[PDB]
Paper text:
Botulinum neurotoxins (BoNTs) are produced by the anaerobic spore-forming bacteria Clostridium botulinum and cause neuromuscular paralysis (i.e., botulism) by proteolytic cleavage of SNARE (soluble N-ethylmaleimide-sensitive factor attachment protein receptor) proteins. However, a BoNT-like gene (homologue of BoNT) was recently identified in the non-clostridial species, Enterococcus faecium, which is the leading cause of hospital-acquired multi-drug resistant infections. Interestingly, BoNT/En possesses the unique ability to cleave at least one member of all three SNARE-protein families (SNAP-25, VAMP, and STX); however, the cleavage of STX1 was only observed in vitro.
The structure of LC/En was determined at 2.0 Å with one molecule in the asymmetric unit by molecular replacement using the predicted structure from the AlphaFold2 server as a search model. Clear electron density was observed throughout the structure except for residues 127–130 and 249–260 which could not be modelled. The analysis indicates that LC/En appears to have a much larger cleft volume than its closest related homologue, LC/X, and is most similar to LC/A. The presence of a glycine residue within the putative S1 subsite is particularly interesting as it would contribute to enhanced flexibility and reduced steric hindrance close to the catalytic zinc ion, such that it is less restricted by which substrate it can accommodate. Additionally, the lysine residues at positions 168 and 195 in place of hydrophobic residues (Phe163 and Phe194 in LC/A) within the S1′ subsite may further contribute to substrate promiscuity, given their increased length, rotamer angles, and potential ability to form both polar and non-polar contacts within the active site depending on the substrate.
Numbering used by the authors: 0 to 248, 262 to 413
Write the structure that this text describes.
């Protein structure tokens, strides 16, 4: 409906356009006097729509994520398999699964708007003596076959496979700009095939769920959206990870998880959010207004992208200033509209009522490319009421242990 999901396949050759050889963003990460990721291979990467890249490789780029074998005390909801995503055939499956998920998200107007937002929400650039331009942390390196850089490419969201634990999913904001008002790209680590399941008792009381459903599997497009929403916050420089936390039901859940998950729990932390909001908005004003007002060319594309990312940003060349009420409204709208709960409703899939869970029922494997399992329009519920296509009992969900 607005972005187009490119039809790419793993075996398609590098074309230096949508299919590139990518050097990882954290290639030069120094942790504790070690260059953690030196000599990691350059990776085949697929731009599935502007500035969103899929890389069918295991995420092994923090030092906690280097060993694919199980640790000493593995969680009961973890699963380890060093061979997952090692062959080219598996990378194609992964790429095709990711493409199907994006098409699902793109199946409604709200998901179209979301993907557009990811596509266009540039991190704010740096001033360079008159010249506003992208900094080195705001681009990925496109490489030849020999370790030389051919050029620098924009990236907003990079999706990789899981780390050691096939079941774990998440968003890694590249830099501290995630919370400074400037923003940064996010690396997501995600398996479309390996999922945790939840009791329907964890679903809210209003839920339309069939009574034969004891235990359900989340729609992988909705789970992907959860992580893309962290992504989006990182692009807007409004990550709430260090802004505060709340103790539920107890255990501590940071504001970033709460606002991302959506639903009722948002009301509990609202008073705390409202104290902090002025500061966040001010970091936004303070970061973007000086930058944009350096641009002396009215046809500058940065100008346009900034005004498009922040419609609250008004004025004329050299003299752009936020509308303070509007910017507050628009940021709050990001959280209120773009969150997991709202996207579950929007794609009509069952999710749970609360981010924190007491336990996982099962861990399962499912291939959404297989015949009769998953459609763009309905995910697991093609021709099902009460979300029955998401019950663990379906032939397409295999329990692991
Ligand atoms: Zn999260």
């Amino acid at each position: 409906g607005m972005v187009t999901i490119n039809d790419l396949h793993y075996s398609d050759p590098i074309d230096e356009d949508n299919i590139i050889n990518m050097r990882i963003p954290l290639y030069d990460l120094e942790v504790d006097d070690q260059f953690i990721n030196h000599n990691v291979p350059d990776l085949k990467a697929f731009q599935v729509f502007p500035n969103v890249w899929v890389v069918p490789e295991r995420y092994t780029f923090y030092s906690t994520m280097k060993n694919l074998d199980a640790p000493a005390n593995p969680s009961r909801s973890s699963y380890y398999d060093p061979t997952y995503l090692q062959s080219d055939a598996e990378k194609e499956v992964f790429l095709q699964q990711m493409i199907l998920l994006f098409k699902r998200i793109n199946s409604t107007q709200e998901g179209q708007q979301f993907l557009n937002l990811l596509s266009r929400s540039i991190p704010v650039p740096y001033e360079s003596n008159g010249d506003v331009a992208m900094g080195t942390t705001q681009v990925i390196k496109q490489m030849d076959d020999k370790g030389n850089v051919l050029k620098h490419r924009r990236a907003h969201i990079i999706i990789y496979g899981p780390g050691p634990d096939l079941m774990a999913k998440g968003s890694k904001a590249l830099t501290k700009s995630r919370e400074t008002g400037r923003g940064c790209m996010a690396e997501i680590y995600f398996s479309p095939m390996y999922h945790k399941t939840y009791s329907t008792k964890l679903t809210n009381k209003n839920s339309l769920v069939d009574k034969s459903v004891q235990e359900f599997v989340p729609d992988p497009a909705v789970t992907l959206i959860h992580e893309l929403c962290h992504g989006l916050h990182a692009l807007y420089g409004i990550d709430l990870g260090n802004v505060g936390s709340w103790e539920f039901n107890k255990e501590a859940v940071n504001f970033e998880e709460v606002m991302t998950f959506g639903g009722e729990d948002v009301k509990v932390i609202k008073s705390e959010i409202d104290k902090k909001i002025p500061g966040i908005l001010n970091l936004i004003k303070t970061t973007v207004e000086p930058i944009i007002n350096k641009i002396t060319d009215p046809h500058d594309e940065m100008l346009q992208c900034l005004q498009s990312k922040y419609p609250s940003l008004k004025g004329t060349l050299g003299q752009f200033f936020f509308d303070d009420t509007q910017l507050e409204k628009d940021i709050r709208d990001l959280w209120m509209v773009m969150n997991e709960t709202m996207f579950a409703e929007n794609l009509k899939a069952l999710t749970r009522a609360r981010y924190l869970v007491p336990k996982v029922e099962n861990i399962v494997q499912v291939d959404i490319l297989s015949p009769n399992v998953y459609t763009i329009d309905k995910g697991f519920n093609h021709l099902s009421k009460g979300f029955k296509g998401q019950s663990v009992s379906q032939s397409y969900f295999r329990k692991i242990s």
